[PDB]
Design a protein around this ligand. Structure first.
Ligand code: HEM
Ligand code: HEM
Ligand SMILES: Cc1cc(N)nc(CCc2cncc([C@H](CN)Cc3cc(C)cc(N)n3)c2)c1
Ligand SMILES: Cc1cc(N)nc(CCc2cncc([C@H](CN)Cc3cc(C)cc(N)n3)c2)c1
Ligand SMILES: C[C@H](O)[C@H](O)[C@H]1CNc2nc(N)[nH]c(=O)c2N1
Ligand SMILES: C[C@H](O)[C@H](O)[C@H]1CNc2nc(N)[nH]c(=O)c2N1
Ligand SMILES: [Zn+2]
Lengths: 405, 404
C-alpha cells in the first residue's frame, strides 16, 4: 500500500493510512529498537522563525488564503518583528485558531469531537497576580454556567526574553486538599499533598476535611506567587448518591463540576504561553474510576465493596470490578440529577470514533495515545479498544512543563 | 540511552538495560509511535551469528560459559552451517530456547510461569498423521483432567528446499462459525474462514454455536489433511452463574485449553513453523473478549436483558454490569468444574512480581502495555499504573502469514 502507517480497526475490519504524521516536526520517545509509548513523561532565533512561519502557514490554510498577499505580508511582518525584537506577537484570530488547534492536536484527549467549539479568552493584557485572579474567576464563571458547562481557555501573556513567567502553581483550578497525617496517611486527595503544603507555607490557613477546595497560587513575572481563595459560590460541586444503593449518599462523597487544567504550556508558532488554563467537562470514569478508586488516590473501593457486602478477601469474587461499576454509576447519576454536564465512557468513545473519521477526511489522520484514550474500566467494551492509533506530536500543542518551584 | 520506567502507584523507578540486547527493530520511529498496531507493517553469516549468540545464551544459562563443551558446540554449529547452510539444535537447547521465547514474549501476562514448560520434541515427525498423534498427546498431557500444565510441541524446522510443516488452525481448539445467507454468523465469527476451509477439505459440518473444529494439518508440499479430535480429548466447561440461575439457560460453554498453533518459534536463527503451545486461561479472555466482543459471540445485550437492565442508554452502564457478571460466571464455572483458570487481578499481580524478578535477573522485561493491561477494570489492576518498555528479544514467537 501507501508509505504511511496503516491503521486498522479490528472490530470493523476497516483500514486507513495516516498521512498527517508527515507534518510532525518534533520527535517523541520511541525508536526502532524500543517502544516507550506507555511512559507518562517523555524526557531561539532562526529556530523561532521557522516555527512561526509554519504556524502562519497553518493559519492561512485554515482560512484558505495560502499564497495570498495577506499571507506573504503577514510572514514578512513576523520576520521583521523577530528581526528587531527577537520575538513576535499573534493577532487575536491567530491565537483563537492556535488554541483550538492545540486542543485538536492533543493525543491524549478523547473529547476532541468538540475541538471547534472553544471559547478563547484573551488575557494577554494581564499585568498582575490580582488581575490573573479576576480573569480566572471570570473563566470559571463562564465555563461553569450553572452546570451547563462550556469549554474554554484563558491565555495570559507569553514568555518574554529576560522577564519572569506568568504561572499558575496549581495543576488544576479546582483541586482538593491533601493533608499529611501523623500516622503517615493522608486526609483528602493524596495527589495534592505538595501543593497543599505550599499553600500553607504561603499563608493559607488549612481546613481538615476530605474535600477542601484549595486556593490558588498565582505568580506574576518576577514576583513570589500570591494566594487567592476562590469564593465558594463559584465552585460547583456535586454530592454523590447512587440510584438504588440508598446508603451510598451516607458516604459523603462529592466531586467538583469543572475539570480545568492550569499547569500546561500552550505553544503556538514557537511562542510559549506558560499560563493558559483550559477547561471542559468530565468523562465519568475520571472521577469514578481514577480519582475515587486509584489506590494512591481516594482509594474507596474496599469501603464500597464492604457496604455492598462483597467478598473482599479473594480476587475471584470480582469485588473490585463490581464496586467500581457502582461508583461510576453513582457519578453519572448524581451529575445528571444535579444537571451538571458529564459524559459516560461509552458515549465519549463513540464520539471519539466519529472524530477519527472526521479528521481522516479533513487532515488524513489523528494523533492519539491509545493507552490514554481507552478508558480505565471496561476498555474492550468501548470501540476505541479495537482501533489502532498512531501517536505523534503536532504543533500548536499543550506540553507538560516543570513545576515552578 | 536507557529508559527510566516508573510505577505511578508506588513512585518506584527502574532503568531498562535489557533492551540493549534487542537485535530486531519494532514498528516505532521518533516521528510516530505504532505500538497499538497488532501486526508489524513489515545468508550464512547472519544465521551463524544468531546461532553463536543463541549457543552463548545456552552455555551461560547452565553456568558453563567458556567450557570445552561450549567451544566444541560453537565449532559443530560453524562446521554445519559452513557445509550445509543450516544446523540443528540439541534437545536440551531446544528446551532452553522454547522457555526463553515464552519469557521474552511481550504480550504475555503469564510469564511468571516461564520456567515450567513441558517441551515435546516432535522433530522426528514426517507426516500429517504423525503430527496428529503428537497433537493428541500434547492435549492429553496439557489438559490433565483439568489440572492444566503448560506445554509446547515442536515440529520440524523450516528448510531451504521445501515447504513448511504447518497447522492451519490458529488454535488447537476453536469453535466453528457458519455464515448464513443473510450475513449473520452461527458460532464464532472469528473462525468463519477456517470453518469454510475445513468444509472444502471434506469436513461434514455441524450446525451449533459451539461445534469443535477439526485440525487441518500440513506436511511439506502436500495439501493439508483433516483430523477430528476425539470429543473426549477436548475438555469443555458449561457456563453457569453463582446466583443468577437463568444464566445456565443461555447454553454457553468454553473449552479448557488455550493452545496457539499458528505462530512461528525462532531459536538461534532456526525457524519452527509448527510449534503449538498452551497454558491456561485468564478469565477475561473468555468472559470479556470471546463472549462480549461485538465481532465475537457478542452476548452482552442478551445478558443485560436477562438481568433486566435499561438497554437504551449508555449511562446505565448496562454493558459494564453485564460484562462483570459474565466474567464472574466463567470464573465460577471453571472453579466448579476444577479446571485451572486465573482471574485478571491475580494474573496481573503475578506479572508485577515477574517484572521485579526479571529486573534482578536480567535488567528488564519487554512488555506490551496494551496487551498486558486487561480489557475490563484496567486501572483496577497494578499493571495499569506500570510503565513498560517494549522490544523484541530472541528466541521469540512471531506471527507468520496464513499458509493458504
Ligand atoms: C469537552 C469535554 C472534554 C472531555 C470530555 C475531555 C476528556 C479528556 C479526558 C478524559 C482526558 C484524559 C484525562 C486524564 O486521564 O487525566 C483528557 C486529556 C486532555 N484533554 Fe481533554 N476533554 C475535554 C475538553 C478539553 C479541552 C477544552 C482541552 C483544551 C482546550 C482539552 C485538552 C486536553 C489535554 C491537553 C489533555 C491531556 C492532559 C494531560 O496530559 O495531563 N480537552 N481530555
Ligand atoms: C500458564 C498460563 C498462561 C497464561 C495465563 C497466559 C496469559 C496470556 C494472555 C492473557 C495473553 C494475551 C492473549 C490475548 O489477548 O489473545 C497471552 C499472550 C501470549 N502468551 Fe501467554 N499465558 C500463559 C502461558 C503461555 C505459554 C505456555 C506460552 C508459550 C509457551 C505463552 C506465550 C504467549 C504468547 C506468544 C502470547 C502472544 C500471543 C499472540 O500474539 O496472539 N503464554 N498470554
Ligand atoms: C480539560 C479537561 C477535561 C477533562 N474531562 N479531563 C481533564 C483531565 C485533566 C487531568 C486531571 N487529573 C490528572 C491529569 C493528568 C494525569 N491523569 C495530569 C498529568 C500528570 C503528569 C505527570 C503528566 C501529564 N501529562 N498529565 C489530567 C481535562
Ligand atoms: C498460551 C496462551 C495462554 C492463554 N491464556 N491465552 C492465550 C491466548 C491466545 C490467543 C487466542 N485468541 C486470539 C489471540 C490473538 C488475538 N487476541 C491472536 C492474534 C491475532 C493477530 C492478528 C496477531 C497476533 N499477534 N495474535 C491469542 C495463549
Ligand atoms: C503507565 C501508564 O502510562 C499510565 O498509568 C497511564 C495509562 N493510561 C492513562 N490514561 C489516562 N487517560 N490517564 C492517565 O493518567 C493514564 N495513565
Ligand atoms: C488495537 C489494539 O492494539 C487491539 O485491540 C489489541 C488491544 N489490546 C489487546 N490485549 C490483548 N491481551 N489481546 C488483544 O487482542 C488485544 N487487542
Ligand atoms: Zn512506540
Amino acid at each position: 500500500g501507501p508509505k504511511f502507517p496503516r491503521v486498522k480497526n479490528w472490530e470493523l475490519g476497516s483500514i486507513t493510512y495516516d498521512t498527517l504524521c508527515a507534518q510532525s516536526q518534533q520527535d517523541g520517545p520511541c525508536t526502532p529498537r524500543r517502544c516507550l509509548g506507555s511512559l507518562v513523561l517523555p524526557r531561539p532565533a532562526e529556530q523561532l522563525l521557522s516555527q512561526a512561519r509554519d504556524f502562519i502557514n497553518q493559519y492561512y490554510s485554515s482560512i484558505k488564503r495560502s499564497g495570498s498577499q495577506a499571507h506573504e505580508e503577514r510572514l514578512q511582518e513576523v520576520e521583521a518583528e523577530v528581526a528587531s525584537t527577537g520575538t513576535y506577537h499573534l493577532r487575536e484570530s491567530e491565537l483563537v485558531f492556535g488554541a483550538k488547534q492545540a486542543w485538536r492536536n492533543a493525543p491524549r484527549c478523547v473529547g476532541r469531537i468538540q475541538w471547534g467549539k472553544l471559547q478563547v479568552f484573551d488575557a494577554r493584557d494581564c499585568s498582575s497576580a490580582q488581575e490573573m485572579f479576576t480573569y480566572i474567576c471570570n473563566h470559571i464563571k463562564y465555563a461553569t454556567n450553572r452546570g451547563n458547562l462550556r469549554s474554554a481557555i484563558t491565555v495570559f501573556p507569553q514568555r518574554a526574553p529576560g522577564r519572569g513567567d506568568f504561572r499558575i502553581w496549581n495543576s488544576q483550578l479546582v483541586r482538593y486538599a491533601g493533608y499529611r497525617q501523623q500516622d503517615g496517611s493522608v486526609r483528602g486527595d493524596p495527589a495534592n499533598v505538595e501543593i497543599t503544603e505550599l499553600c500553607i507555607q504561603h499563608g493559607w490557613t488549612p481546613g481538615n476535611g476530605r474535600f477542601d477546595v484549595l486556593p490558588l497560587l498565582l505568580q506574576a513575572p518576577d514576583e513570589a506567587p500570591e494566594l487567592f481563595v476562590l469564593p465558594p459560590e463559584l465552585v460547583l460541586e456535586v454530592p454523590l448518591e447512587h440510584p438504588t444503593l440508598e446508603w451510598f449518599a451516607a458516604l459523603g462523597l462529592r466531586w467538583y463540576a469543572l475539570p480545568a487544567v492550569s499547569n500546561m504550556l500552550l505553544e503556538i508558532g514557537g511562542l510559549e504561553f506558560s499560563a493558559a488554563p483550559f477547561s471542559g467537562w468530565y468523562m465519568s470514569t475520571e472521577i469514578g474510576t481514577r480519582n475515587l478508586c486509584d489506590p494512591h488516590r481516594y482509594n474507596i473501593l474496599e469501603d464500597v465493596a464492604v457496604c455492598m457486602d462483597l467478598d473482599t478477601r479473594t480476587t475471584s469474587s470480582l469485588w473490585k470490578d463490581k464496586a467500581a461499576v457502582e461508583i461510576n454509576l453513582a457519578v453519572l447519576h448524581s451529575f445528571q440529577l444535579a444537571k451538571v454536564t458529564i459524559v459516560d465512557h461509552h458515549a465519549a468513545t463513540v464520539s471519539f470514533m466519529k472524530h477519527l473519521d472526521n479528521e481522516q477526511k479533513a487532515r488524513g489522520g489523528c494523533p492519539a495515545d491509545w493507552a490514554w484514550i481507552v478508558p480505565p474500566i471496561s476498555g474492550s467494551l468501548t470501540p476505541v479498544f479495537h482501533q489502532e492509533m498512531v501517536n505523534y506530536i503536532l504543533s500548536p500543542a499543550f506540553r507538560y512543563q516543570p513545576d515552578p518551584w
